Amino acid sequence: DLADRFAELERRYDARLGVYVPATGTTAAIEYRADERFAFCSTFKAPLVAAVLHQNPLTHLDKLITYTSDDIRSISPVAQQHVQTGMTIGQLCDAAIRYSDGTAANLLLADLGGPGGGTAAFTGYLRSLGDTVSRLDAEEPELNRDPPGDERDTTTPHAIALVLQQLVLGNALPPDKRALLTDWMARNTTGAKAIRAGFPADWKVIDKTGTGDYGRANDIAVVWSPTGVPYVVAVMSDRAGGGYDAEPREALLAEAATCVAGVLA
C-alpha cells in the first residue's frame, strides 16, 4: 500500500518522510508521519505573504521598502539585485514566494513587526487559523539550521496542509488577496522538481518549496485535477543520518508526490 511506498522511499533516500493530504468529499486523508515535526525551511514564506496581505490594505503592496548590504544574509536571488533601489512590499512578496528570497522574507517579517523580528506575529497568524502546532522562532538563515528533533522553526505536514487549505481554498483571505497569494504560488519558479513533478501535466499545481540543512526538502502545494477538484499536498523530508551537510533530495518529494497522484487520480 501507500505507507509501504513511503517507507521504501525513506530507505532509498536515507530520509524521514512526512506526507499529508486532507480528506475531501470522496477521499480519506493521506497521512504518513503527518503529525511529526519538520523544519518549515522556506515553506513558511507562503503563509508569511498571506499574513502580510491579511494585515494591510491591498495598496500596502505599493509601499517601497529600503534595505542594505547587511540585510542580505541568506539566499535572495531577487533582493540582491535591487538593494540600491529598494523593493515594494508587492515585489518582496513576489520574490519570497517565487524565488524563495530570504531577504524578502526577513523584510516581510519585519513589516509584520513585533517581537522576534516578526516571528511571533507570524506564529500568531497561524494560531488565528487554528494551527496550535507550528512555531517560527528565527528568521533566515538561522531557521534552516535547528538540529533534527528540535521543535524550533517547525510545522507538521498535517498542520501546514490545513493552513494552506484555508489560505487558498478557504476564506482566511478575502477573494482579492486570496488570488494574489494563489497567483504567486502558481508562478513559483523553484518547484518544478518537487510536487509538480509527480502530478500529470493536466493537473494545476501551485506550490512553495523549502530546503535547509540536514538534507531538508519540503514542498507544500495545492493541486487541481483536470476537472477542477482541489487537493492540498504537504510533503516534508529530512536526512539527519547524513549530518548537517546532508544534501536535500527533491527527487524524494517527486516520488512521494507521484505516489500521492496515483491515489488521487
Curated annotation (Swiss-Prot):
It is found in: Periplasm; Secreted. The active site is at residues 42, 140. It is an enzyme of class 3 (hydrolase). Transmembrane segments: none annotated. InterPro entries: Beta-lactam/transpept-like, Beta-lactam_cat, Beta-lactam_class-A, Beta-lactam_class-A_AS. Substrate binds at residues 100, 209-211. Exported by the Tat system. The position of the signal peptide cleavage has not been experimentally proven. One of its GO terms (biological process) is beta-lactam antibiotic catabolic process. It catalyses: a beta-lactam + H2O = a substituted beta-amino acid. GO terms for molecular function: beta-lactamase activity. One of its GO terms (cellular component) is periplasmic space. The record marks 45 as: Increases nucleophilicity of active site Ser. Its main location: periplasm. Is inhibited by clavulanate. The record marks 75 as: Functions as a gatekeeper residue that regulates substrate accessibility to the enzyme active site. Keywords: Antibiotic resistance, Hydrolase, Periplasm, Secreted, Signal. Its EC number is 3.5.2.6. PANTHER family: BETA-LACTAMASE, BETA-LACTAMASE-TYPE TRANSPEPTIDASE FOLD CONTAINING PROTEIN. Extended spectrum beta-lactamase (ESBL) that inactivates beta-lactam antibiotics by hydrolyzing the amide group of the beta-lactam ring. Displays high levels of penicillinase and cephalosporinase activity as well as measurable activity with carbapenems, including imipenem and meropenem. Plays a primary role in the intrinsic resistance of M.tuberculosis to beta-lactam antibiotics. Belongs to the class-A beta-lactamase family. Monomer. The class A beta-lactamase family has a specific amino-acid numbering system, sometimes called Ambler or ABL numbering and often misspelt as Amber. A multiple sequence alignment was used to derive a consensus sequence and then the consensus was numbered taking into account insertions and deletions. This allows use of identical numbers, e.g. for active site residues, despite differences in protein length. UniProt always uses natural numbering of residues, hence there appear to be differences in numbering between this entry and some papers. This is Beta-lactamase.
